Nucleic acid binder design. Structure first.
Ligand SMILES: [Mg+2]
Ligand SMILES: [Mg+2]
Ligand SMILES: [Mg+2]
Ligand SMILES: [Mg+2]
Ligand SMILES: [Mg+2]
Ligand SMILES: [Mg+2]
Ligand SMILES: [Mg+2]
Ligand SMILES: [Mg+2]
Ligand SMILES: [Mg+2]
Ligand SMILES: [Mg+2]
Ligand SMILES: [Mg+2]
Ligand SMILES: [Mg+2]
Ligand SMILES: [Mg+2]
Ligand SMILES: [Mg+2]
Ligand SMILES: [Mg+2]
Ligand SMILES: [Mg+2]
Ligand SMILES: [Mg+2]
Ligand SMILES: [Mg+2]
Ligand SMILES: [Mg+2]
Ligand SMILES: [Mg+2]
Ligand SMILES: [Mg+2]
Ligand SMILES: [Mg+2]
Ligand SMILES: [Mg+2]
Ligand SMILES: [Mg+2]
Ligand SMILES: [Mg+2]
Ligand SMILES: [Mg+2]
Ligand SMILES: [Mg+2]
Ligand SMILES: [Mg+2]
Ligand SMILES: [Mg+2]
Ligand SMILES: [Mg+2]
Ligand SMILES: [Mg+2]
Ligand SMILES: [Mg+2]
Ligand SMILES: [Mg+2]
Ligand SMILES: [Mg+2]
Ligand SMILES: [Mg+2]
Ligand SMILES: [Mg+2]
Ligand SMILES: [Mg+2]
Ligand SMILES: [Mg+2]
Lengths: 44, 272
RNA sequence: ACCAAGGGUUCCAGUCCAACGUUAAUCGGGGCUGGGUGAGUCGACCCCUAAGGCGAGGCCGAAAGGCGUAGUCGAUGGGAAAAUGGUUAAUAUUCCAUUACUUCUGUGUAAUGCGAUGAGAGGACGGAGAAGGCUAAAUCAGCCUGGCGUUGGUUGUCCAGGUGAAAGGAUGUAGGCAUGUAUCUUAGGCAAAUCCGGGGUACUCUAUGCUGAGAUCUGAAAGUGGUUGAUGCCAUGCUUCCAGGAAAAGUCUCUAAGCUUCAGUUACACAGGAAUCGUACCCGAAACCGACACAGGUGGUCAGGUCGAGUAGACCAAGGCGCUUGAGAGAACUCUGCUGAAGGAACUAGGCAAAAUGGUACCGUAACUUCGGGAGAAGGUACGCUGUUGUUGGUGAUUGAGCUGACGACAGCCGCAGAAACCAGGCCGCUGCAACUGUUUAUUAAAAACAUAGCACUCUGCAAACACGAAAGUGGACGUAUAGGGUGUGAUGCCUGCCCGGUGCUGGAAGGUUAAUUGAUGGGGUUA
RNA sequence: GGGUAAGUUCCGACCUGCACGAAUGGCAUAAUGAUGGCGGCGCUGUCUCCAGCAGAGGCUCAGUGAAAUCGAAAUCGCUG
RNA sequence: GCGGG
RNA sequence: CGCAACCA
């Protein structure tokens, strides 16, 4: 059985990384939320 | 003419191809070719805006001279080539000053013929003249609408218009539709008929031959569910509705032209 | 056996056995303590661009924001160069040995026109099909070394092992492509050009050039010949067909501006440089995705022997393993197999499942047909080993020796059986549906459902109809009525009757009715 | 009417079409189909009717060691 | 509430 | 008999 994850590290960074989240307004809100909660890792 | 294949397979029994002998066998003229990518029928937003488009053979684009703005200088036809983007054949012209161009090939044209442009050109198939200087009754193609824009009407494989006559400052012509239109006498046209003219006797014979040309299959609206098409639904076959498009517009006889800017150029309608 | 992705120390050594390991463990991919990844040539970075993204100005939008020009990113594609042996417990095209190659700087020596953000060439590219010439590889013979066999024989027409060194450098062959050359000229190439393109002549076609495998030479105890022979090289070639088959830089030609005896350019010698990052280990896997040391999934590369058409199949090579609970017993019953008297579908909803057929050559084959088919229709005969006698194909030492491929007859011998095991079509008659190849309910439905080539109706004259968007704009289409969109039917043959009253659609326009707007009149309220 | 010893299925006709019918096409049609129905030849453990044998379990010994369920139990038959 | 016949 | 008109 082929499963859903199928990792690729370039695609991980290009969809979810720091610069992706910083390039939009809703991503900057994700980052503000995660800094207010105190997460030890901001992004993937 | 038209060749029929032997029925050695079920897929070859109904293949009828148009074969011409005078066509060039070789590569196109490289300074006049560019790259054309496929679209899948999708726009800016990435949405499908034309259904049944996708796939096909990789195709270049031959840059064709529709304006014909080298007046006085005569040319000689070098060869006639197959063009993948249109239904007509094209011709490679070599002007007397050395330049090379492509044009839509007229019907009788072969390698070695002379063509010219301008309001001084002899009345010969392949010559581009203003409608002001063309005898009444002529058969024409590659006709301009706006002055300097290039040919827009009667460009496909075997088309032609008929110059019915000039009055005031407008020529009156009859299109392949049957419509009677008027055009400004300062617009250009080419003498003759378009080349291929036997295109429509071709039979593909098999479903993959349509996919070679970038056409994807059509699903009948009758064959869907009510959430996809106004024809969807039902136990068994049924079409208890007046035919409409996927977006609700009537499909049998309802007219859709809504352009009040141009109704004065239309002289007679095609259904009158 | 080896790469990419993914993982992240699992790699190697010493030491320990609680937990972890479906049992014990002295062992381990477990715990603890140390060690281990060496590059101008491999890769990444770097130069170049595809789809796509972002986008100074700009256009659009209550705000938030959307799109897009110049640009700038983005490989999965284009762009310099290294081979053969040895060495570590663990790295090696990286270290060492020998022999190379590429590209930059300096300092010099001789010559003299160099020069783009411009123009041109090139890079530059499809599917299929073969024929030839090679090489890798395999195999036999010769040659060197060793042997003389627990049991008949084995000093030979015996046995075993070994024995064919690369990149690079010099030469230039088979094959492939284009007719080439001086002079005069020139409505073109964003302006110029000595260059590309177009014309005028004269001389040429066993002439000019270009490219390009291999072999030979060199590197360099035995170390030589044959046969077979690529999926590799010539080959980004040749033939053929229609569905007509990326871009940009590196590179080459030419001048513009710009200095102008300087700079730049190019020929050589000497002297130096080529940074940074990755490199261990796992790959049909116990280290990746599946909660597990999970019978699943996971792109690409290599891949020997006998027989064989074969990368199928049986048995082996190199290499790697016996799959982390065992020991006994040999009950019913369950699973997976093998054989079975006489009968042969009587079983069952149903021949479900099993049994059966099976290769090569030759003989032979019905209705029907769209003339291709049906058809491997159906059915039949031969096939092993030994000997003798015939034709032929390839290669070719000294015309043709040696090795090798295909086909015949005769004669004999053995068995129940010669296609020997593995491998390897069951077939025929009547009939409904759908013409056919194809698609579909990931995980109870593969079909008569969907699609299809062909047929018809209708819309659409181009700033097209149509669709997406709030708009800007985008697709249709760099298309133009033999084109494009919607709708029904569904190859082909013969065909497709009657009804316009209902609802739609198309046309018509004299009358009736009817909105905003306009406000003629009439009535009232207030008081001089 | 045919096929079987015997045929609610099959094939061929009849027409009394509850309630066929001509591009939501009508009637056929070579070839094709892991498509629906029916009949044959071969072959058989499908069956009459099961027997023997081989491997893996079952069972016994040693080691490790689950599951759903569960108000509590001192948890028999028959007739009411 | 407008025109009918 | 057609067109247009009520929100107890
Ligand atoms: Mg369509
Ligand atoms: Mg449905
Ligand atoms: Mg449904
Ligand atoms: Mg609806
Ligand atoms: Mg029904
Ligand atoms: Mg280890
Ligand atoms: Mg243990
Ligand atoms: Mg360890
Ligand atoms: Mg770097
Ligand atoms: Mg943008
Ligand atoms: Mg801006
Ligand atoms: Mg870039
Ligand atoms: Mg790459
Ligand atoms: Mg190692
Ligand atoms: Mg090819
Ligand atoms: Mg002896
Ligand atoms: Mg090399
Ligand atoms: Mg390694
Ligand atoms: Mg295991
Ligand atoms: Mg596994
Ligand atoms: Mg029996
Ligand atoms: Mg018997
Ligand atoms: Mg029975
Ligand atoms: Mg019975
Ligand atoms: Mg069966
Ligand atoms: Mg069987
Ligand atoms: Mg079908
Ligand atoms: Mg599927
Ligand atoms: Mg399913
Ligand atoms: Mg299924
Ligand atoms: Mg249908
Ligand atoms: Mg039909
Ligand atoms: Mg009809
Ligand atoms: Mg029966
Ligand atoms: Mg019907
Ligand atoms: Mg009908
Ligand atoms: Mg099929
Ligand atoms: Mg026990």
């Amino acid at each position: 059985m082929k499963r859903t994850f199928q990792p690729s590290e370039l695609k991980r960074k290009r969809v979810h990384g720091f610069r992706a989240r910083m390039a939009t307004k809703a991503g900057r809100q994700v980052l503000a939320r995660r800094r207010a909660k105190g997460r030890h890792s901001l992004t993937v | 003419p038209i060749q029929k294949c032997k029925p050695t397979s079920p897929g070859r029994r109904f293949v009828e191809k148009v074969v011409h002998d005078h066509l060039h066998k070789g590569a196109p003229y490289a300074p006049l070719v560019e790259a054309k990518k496929r679209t899948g029928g999708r726009n800016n937003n990435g949405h499908i805006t034309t259904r049944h488009v996708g796939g096909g053979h990789k195709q270049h684009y031959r840059i064709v001279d529709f304006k014909r703005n080298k007046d006085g200088v005569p040319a000689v036809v070098e060869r006639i080539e197959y063009d993948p983007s249109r239904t007509a054949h094209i011709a490679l012209l070599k002007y007397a000053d050395g330049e090379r161009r492509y044009i839509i090939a007229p019907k009788g044209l072969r390698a070695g013929d002379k063509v010219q442009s301008g309001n001084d050109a002899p009345i010969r198939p392949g010559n581009c003249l203003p409608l002001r200087n063309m005898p009444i009754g002529s058969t024409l193609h590659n006709v301009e609408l706006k002055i300097g824009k290039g040919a827009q009407l009667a460009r496909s494989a075997g088309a032609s218009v008929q110059l019915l006559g000039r009055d005031g400052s407008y020529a009156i012509i009859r299109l392949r539709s049957g419509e009677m239109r008027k055009v400004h006498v300062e617009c250009r046209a080419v003498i003759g008929e378009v080349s291929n003219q036997e295109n429509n006797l071709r039979s593909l014979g098999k479903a993959g031959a349509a996919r070679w040309r970038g056409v994807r299959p059509t699903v009948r609206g009758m064959a869907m569910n009510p959430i996809d098409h106004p024809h969807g639904g039902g136990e068994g076959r049924n079409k208890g509705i007046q035919p409409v498009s996927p977006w609700g517009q009537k499909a049998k006889g309802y007219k859709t032209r809504t352009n009040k800017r141009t109704t004065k150029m239309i002289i007679r309608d095609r259904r009158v």
